Design a protein around this ligand. Structure first.
Ligand SMILES: O=C1NCc2c(-c3cnc4[nH]cc(Cc5ccccc5)c4c3)c[nH]c21
Length: 277
């Protein structure tokens, strides 16, 4: 750790959590291993308040070059904060640690599929609106997500949705052993991603919400999705989805990227639909 560039060490200071400010429960994993090496933790802020956090150990990092790049990803992610985006609490320099807020209700796809929880049509639309708000913030920062889906959004104790699976919170479902159906047509064809391809994925996430987590295109092979979309076939209107909201979903899947709504338009339209409930 003495081998690190001093100006870079000075630059990461506002992101670094001192070792005496973090208690990691290395004996308690979060999410039964499905989310990788992520543990319960307690972060102590400047006032001494105990913060329940999720602590990811980064085993893929060994060399100083990899450590330096990790410090930089911490610096940039720390500048992203919004009520509907998963915030970085900090990093701890054993392997490097990523400290994230604890999300009591786990991923949004499992939450809505959960037979115990009974979200209403209003609640599901409200979750979609929160995702559109988080994406509107990311798109305003010129950030392209590339993997937007309900499985990649977390839900906290106040039922606030947080867009996740970006920055140091990426590779969240990478488990140790002993997304073409959300992709825009141009991304399937050219492998290039834009905010307009995130809008297409958002439309698929909205369909996931309104079907309470049904898998999209269950009878279509991932290879055949491209031709299926070029034929002009699309995900159908879910049973209790209001017509104006499905019109918004369909606009997200327009084959011409420039014809799709912006996330600002999506927040606008969905907020007005949500307000009817
Ligand atoms: O059944 C569950 N109860 C809580 C929970 C979580 C949970 C809790 N807190 C969290 N904080 C940040 C994340 C996402 C994340 C996880 C691993 C790596 C990178 C990012 C996260 C996920 C996942 N499943 C379940």
């Amino acid at each position: 750790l003495s081998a690190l560039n001093p100006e870079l060490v000075q630059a990461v200071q506002h992101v670094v959590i001192g070792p005496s400010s973090l208690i990691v429960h290395f004996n308690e994993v979060i999410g039964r291993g499905h989310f990788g090496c992520v543990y319960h933790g307690t972060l102590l802020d400047n006032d001494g308040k105990k913060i329940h956090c999720a602590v990811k150990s980064l085993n893929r990092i060994t060399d100083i070059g990899e450590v330096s790049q990790f410090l930089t990803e911490g610096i940039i992610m720390k500048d992203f904060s919004h009520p509907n985006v998963l915030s970085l609490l900090g990093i701890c320099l054993g392997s490097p640690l990523v400290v994230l807020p604890y999300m009591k209700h786990g991923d949004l796809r499992n939450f809505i599929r959960n037979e115990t929880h009974n979200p209403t049509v209003k609640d599901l639309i409200g979750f979609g609106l929160q995702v559109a708000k988080g994406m509107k913030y990311l798109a305003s920062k010129k950030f392209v997500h590339r993997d937007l889906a309900a499985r990649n959004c977390m839900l906290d104790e106040k039922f606030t949705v947080k867009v996740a699976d970006f920055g140091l919170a990426r590779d969240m479902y990478d488990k140790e052993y002993y997304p073409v159906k959300w992709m825009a047509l141009e991304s399937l064809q050219t492998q290039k991603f834009t905010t307009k391809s995130d809008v297409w994925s958002f439309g698929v996430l909205l369909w996931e919400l309104m079907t309470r987590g049904a898998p999209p295109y269950p009878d279509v092979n991932t290879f055949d999705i491209t031709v299926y979309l070029l034929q002009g076939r699309r995900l159908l209107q879910p049973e209790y989805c209001p017509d104006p909201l499905y019109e918004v979903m369909l606009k997200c899947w327009h084959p011409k990227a420039e014809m799709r709504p912006s996330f600002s338009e999506l927040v606008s339209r969905i907020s007005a639909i949500f307000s009817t409930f």
